[PDB]
């Protein structure tokens, strides 16, 4: 009946998995088949994609410092996750997590998405700030459902082309 096992020390765990909180893996999911998706995310890792989560995301930056490039009231704001910070992101707020420090570790909690509720991933033009490409996905496994999504964007000039100013988006690296 204790489906997810008994209580364990969190720092030690983080230490035991330090080799997975670094590229290319970069994050690790604490429990499997749970309704709460509990993830530790490591560094370093930058990315150009923005996430459109239809549910809330909870952050607690345990070690080191990160930041979330945001889109808030139509402007490109930025949330700082200094060490020891917690943050609660409301549904659908577009966010792009940047984690430059090696050895950093941030607790990110989310919930499973019920059938029909779709996550969006989308990129924006560094020139005019328009929307360049959005992909909606039914998230089940974050490792089998998500790398291919980005890889197909990187590998297509068409998808990356701003439909407004014509500028082609850089792709993997800003």
Query: Contact residues for Fe ion (CB under 5 A)?
Result: 51, 53, 125, 127-128, 130, 162, 165, 167
106 known ligand binder: no
CA distance 18 to 43: 10
The beta-strand segments (E) located in the chain are 27-29, 36-41, 50-52, 57-63, 66-70, 78-81, 86-89, 95-98, 105-111, 119-124, 131-137
Nearer to Fe ion, 16 or 149 (CB): 149
133 known ligand binder: no
- What's the closest the beta carbon of residue 86 comes to Fe ion, in angstroms? 16
125 known ligand binder: yes
Among candidate residues 149, 153, 146, the one with its CA nearest the CA of residue 172: 153
Enumerate the known binding-site residues: 47, 51, 57, 95, 99, 110, 125, 128, 162, 165
Specify binding-site residues for Fe cation.
51, 57, 95, 125, 128, 162, 165
Binding residues for O2: 47
């Amino acid at each position: 009946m204790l489906t997810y096992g008994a209580p364990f020390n969190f720092p030690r765990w983080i230490d035991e998995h330090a080799h997975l909180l670094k590229p290319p893996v970069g994050n690790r999911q604490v429990w499997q088949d749970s309704d709460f998706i509990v993830t530790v995310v490591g560094g370093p890792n930058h990315r150009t994609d923005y996430h459109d989560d239809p549910l809330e995301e909870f952050f607690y930056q345990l070690r080191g410092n990160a930041y979330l490039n945001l889109w808030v009231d139509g402007r490109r704001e930025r949330a700082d996750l200094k060490e020891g910070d917690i943050f609660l992101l409301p549904p659908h707020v577009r966010h792009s997590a940047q984690r430059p420090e090696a050895g950093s570790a941030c607790l990110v909690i989310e919930r499973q998405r019920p059938a029909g509720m779709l996550d969006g991933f989308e990129w924006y033009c560094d020139a005019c700030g328009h929307l360049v490409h959005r992909v909606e996905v039914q998230l089940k496994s974050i490792v089998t459902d998500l790398p291919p999504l980005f890889e197909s964007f990187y590998a297509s000039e068409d998808k990356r082309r701003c439909p407004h100013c014509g500028q082609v988006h850089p792709g993997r690296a800003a």
